[PDB]
């Protein structure tokens, strides 16, 4: 506090918007260099034109402030009229540059917005990763070196943007996992893989953002359980009964007790043996990833030992 009192702190942290913009500019430079350079030139020209417009407003204020006479009987006011006309014409000419800027930014957004969202998510996961083991701590230069590896080392170096974007994304995920897990303990590799899987799952359209069942899968032990609720002990113990009661609050698992009582012959795919390979019941159609999430919830409820193997196969 002795030093803290005398000085004020100016913290230069990293934000999601800044990181997304930086990654978008980098992928623009490494993907469409002409588009990137013309976008930079258009931004610079727009900035200098806005500066010129503000200078014109100040000059008009000063000219109407410091002549001290009749405007209609002077030639400085005639020059003022000429300036107003010519720079109203350049204000008119601003519109086409604005339209070209709009076209460029909409193309760039529609082509590389999910990539930059993945950029921000992966870097923030890497930064929050220090809360686990407090040994590995990575900086932003590590992420920038990862990008210098991704955008400049391409297998089959395709020349097609639609395939190249997907190739870059999957190569990014793979090499980020490799470069992080190379210096990170084997006990947490499945945790980092799960976080990267969540990032890609949120990025990929088609799977409806499994937030409720992910929240239950992460915080199923901390939720309040029913008091005095005693399910059947026909083939499952008290811990499995409590886990089934806790899991039954999900909309997918309504008739869990009825289904496990009816499926008496399937007493092996949910209890004993190795239930990771074959899981009973199901997730209306369901995506394969959603079926995997539902089977992972079932594994956590019934056989919590095989959770790591089921996470690996998920």
């Amino acid at each position: 506090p002795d030093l803290c009192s005398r000085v004020t702190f100016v913290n230069f942290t990293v934000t999601r918007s800044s990181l997304q913009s930086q990654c978008l500019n980098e992928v623009l430079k490494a993907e469409r260099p002409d588009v990137d350079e013309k976008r930079s030139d258009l931004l610079k020209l727009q900035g200098e034109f806005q500066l010129r417009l503000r200078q014109l407003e100040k000059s008009l204020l000063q000219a109407l402030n410091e002549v001290k006479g009749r405007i209609l009987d002077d030639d400085t006011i005639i020059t003022t009229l000429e300036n107003l006309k010519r720079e109203a014409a350049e204000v008119t000419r601003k519109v086409e540059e604005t339209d070209i800027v709009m076209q460029e930014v909409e193309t760039v957004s529609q082509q590389y917005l999910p990539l930059s969202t993945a950029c921000s998510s992966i870097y923030f996961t890497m930064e929050s990763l220090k809360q686990i083991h407090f040994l590995y701590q990575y900086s932003l230069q590590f992420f920038l070196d990862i990008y210098h590896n991704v955008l400049y080392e391409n297998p089959n170096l395709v020349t097609d943007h639609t395939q190249r974007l997907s190739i870059i994304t999957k190569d990014l995920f793979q090499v980020a996992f490799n470069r992080v897990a190379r210096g990170m303990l084997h006990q947490d590799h499945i945790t980092f893989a799960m976080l990267l899987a969540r990032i890609k799952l949120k990025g990929t359209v088609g799977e409806p953002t499994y937030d409720a069942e992910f929240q239950h899968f992460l915080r199923g032990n901390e939720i309040v359980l029913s008091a005095g609720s005693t399910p059947r002990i026909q083939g499952l113990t008290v811990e499995q009964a409590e886990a089934v009661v806790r899991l039954s609050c999900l909309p997918a698992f309504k008739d869990l007790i009825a289904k496990v009582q009816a499926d008496e012959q399937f007493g092996i795919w949910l209890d004993s043996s190795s239930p990771e390979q074959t899981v009973p019941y199901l997730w209306t159609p369901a995506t394969p990833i959603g079926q995997a999430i539902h089977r992972l919830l079932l594994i956590q409820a019934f056989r919590p030992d095989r959770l790591l193997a089921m996470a690996h196969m998920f």
């Binding site: 005398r6 209609l72 005639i78």
Partner: protein, 164 residues
């Protein structure tokens, strides 16, 4: 907020009354400089609007002179046609018509000037009217800005936004 961050488990810096003195000094300085800036802007806008009013008055005077001396040329032409000395009358009528051409050109040019400057006037008057509302919020705006500029300097974007 520092207690909440400590309960969360992050790293914090203890706050001191030096921060309070710095915030109150920033509040005073910002209030004074914003008051001076808005006063200078209003002075400039008042000068501009008064000069535009004077120009409109001169335009109206030029229009009145134009129509009066147009009627004068019509009367002189009627008198010359009745009297149809003659060369001097023709020269006088030609001089009056040349003056009419000059005055009409000046009137049209001033009307074009007024039309071009009406686009600035329609926003200048709006800013002058909005000045009354924007001068009553300077205290709260300067308080918020000084508090942010002297207090929220250490935290991240989320905690800065929460404090604001």
């Amino acid at each position: 907020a520092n207690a909440r961050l400590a309960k969360r488990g992050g790293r914090t810096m203890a706050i001191t009354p030096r921060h309070y003195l710095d915030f109150i000094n920033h509040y005073a300085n910002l209030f004074h400089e914003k008051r001076s800036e808005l006063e200078e802007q209003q002075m400039h806008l008042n000068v501009g609007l008064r000069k535009i009013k004077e120009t409109v008055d001169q335009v109206e005077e030029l229009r009145r002179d134009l129509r009066i001396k147009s009627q004068e040329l019509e009367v002189k032409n009627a008198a010359a046609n009745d009297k149809l000395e003659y060369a001097v009358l023709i020269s006088e009528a030609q001089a009056i018509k040349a003056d009419l051409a000059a005055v009409e050109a000046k009137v049209n040019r001033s009307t074009a000037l007024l039309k071009s400057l009406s686009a600035e006037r329609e926003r200048w008057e709006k800013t002058s009217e909005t000045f009354k509302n924007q001068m009553s919020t300077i205290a709260g705006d300067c308080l918020l800005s000084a508090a942010f500029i002297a207090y929220a300097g250490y935290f991240d974007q989320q905690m800065r936004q929460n404090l604001f």
